[PDB]
Amino acid sequence: QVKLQQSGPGLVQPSQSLSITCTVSGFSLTCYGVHWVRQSPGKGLEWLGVIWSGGDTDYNAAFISRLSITKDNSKSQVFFKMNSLQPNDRAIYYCARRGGDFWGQGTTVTVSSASTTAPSVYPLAPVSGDQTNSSVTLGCLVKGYFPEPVTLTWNSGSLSSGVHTFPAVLQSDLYTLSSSVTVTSSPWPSETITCNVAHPASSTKVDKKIEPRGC
Amino acid sequence: DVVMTQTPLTLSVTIGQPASISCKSSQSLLDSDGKTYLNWLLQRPGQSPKRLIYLVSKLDSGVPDRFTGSGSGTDFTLKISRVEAEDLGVYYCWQGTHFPRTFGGGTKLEIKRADAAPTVSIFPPSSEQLTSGGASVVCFLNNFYPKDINVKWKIDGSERQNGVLNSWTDQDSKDSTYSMSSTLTLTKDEYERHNSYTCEATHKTSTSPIVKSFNRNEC
Fold first, then answer.
1. CB distance B146 to B168 below 8 Å
2. Do residue B49 and residue A141 have CB atoms under 8 angstroms apart?
């Protein structure tokens, strides 16, 4: 295998430091440099720095003053740590192999002095189903949460096709995410559809099985 | 620094039709060691970037051979012979000869397919949510092609334009269409204080809007 799995805080308060640990696997840190680039929402891939196999680093002038990339050859881990984080340093941070391009899952950083609110997962079921044996569409709603990173799925990945997860929208400083699923008419009553959600920040794992209703 | 400029900013193209994207640097990318360091990446929605080409023309493993890398010095060009539904995403170009290891700004690739009307679905506030201070009526207008659409709510005929939050999906790697969801949200009482809730989407496929609604008096 070959993959750079990363870990770090999704929320940070202004000025507070940020530290992300990239745990590479599948190759050697004594043979490959690890790049740290981030992605400001809308903006794009900005390069922040690198630590070469010889432990020697090269930084982006714009960040040098507050960046500290270190690593542990044997532990197979690079260490990114930036200081004095301001609200505009909110982005998705990456860890990408120097050579054979392998990137990391990404680690999103929100920089605000605000709550970590746990989401409310409410199912969405069709009041009256479609008699025509074509399709039936269910949904899931995730309101009231803060650090944007939140995962959602249907029947725990088993239900993949027909899934549409819409990016969360922010109103009065809170996020609301929503996902849909469109099984055939036959599936919903027989097959058990469930929307599994989880806001990594408050450690909230939830399961909402879409059930029939009537008004 | 090395200013990388990708010219086509956005680019719509029919599946099967050729697509070239150009990347130009403000400095030659040929290094003293004799090599030119330029690699083309691809970042599909959601996922992480993937490098498709490296060393201007070499292809990465698994990277389909429909991609052609070419260029020299400051002028490089990417070329997809026939674009497929899975080519969607933004393409970037980076240089590894000079140190700030700069990146091109990106080139959005939008796949042109025929028009498609939304498959609108309406959802009433689930009792569990009702037990709280509010109620949210959600409308799913999905699978329409041209991204542009507009949903207008109505409560007992009187259109609602406040307390609504829309959200688009961004082109689907399969079926290449778009999607959106609109959620009108009221106060629990202000909700059951009415009867019919209307979600209606005006798309280019028709001259009259697509209307989906429900009545609290009947399922």
1. no
2. no
Residue A139 has its nearest CB partner, among B50, B138, B218, at B138
Q: Are the beta carbons of B219 and A127 separated by less than 8 Å?
A: yes
Tell me, which fold does domain A1-113 have in CATH?
Answer: Immunoglobulin-like (2.60.40)
- B148 with B159: CB under 8 angstroms? no
Amino acid at B111: I
Q: Please state the domain extents for chain A.
A: 1-113, 114-212
Q: Inspect the interface and report whether the beta carbons of B181 and A46 lie closer than 8 Å.
A: no
Q: Which residues pair with B199 in a beta bridge?
A: B153, B212
Cβ of B165 under 8 Å from any chain A Cβ?
A: yes
CA separation for the pair A58, B155 (Å, rounded): 59
How far, in Å, CA of A15 to CA of A201, rounded?
20
Residue A34 in contact with residue A78, Cβ under 8 Å? yes
Cβ-based contacts of B106 with chain A (< 8 Å): 44-45
Distance (Å, whole) CA A150 – CA B32: 47
Task: Please state the domain count of chain B.
Answer: 2
Q: How was this structure determined?
A: X-ray
Is any Cβ of chain A less than 8 angstroms from the Cβ of B197? no
- Let me know how long chain A is: 215
Neighbours of B168 (CB within 10 A): 16
CA–CA distance, A10 with A165 (Å, rounded to integer) = 20
CA distances from A25 to A3, A6, A32 (A): 6, 11, 11
> How far apart (Å, rounded) are the C-alpha atoms in residues B126 and A201?
26
Q: What number of other Cβ atoms are within 10 A of residue A49's Cβ?
A: 20
The minimal CB distance from B181 to the residues A104, A178, A182 is found for: A178
The closest of A66, A115, A93 to A4, measured between CA atoms, is A93
Deposited resolution, Å: 2.9
- Please choose, from the candidates A36, A121, A96, the residue with its C-alpha nearest in 3D space to the C-alpha of residue A70: A36
Nearest CA in chain A to B215: A215
According to CATH, what is the number of the domain A114-212? 2.60.40.10
Q: Is B144 touching A (CB cutoff 8 A)?
A: no
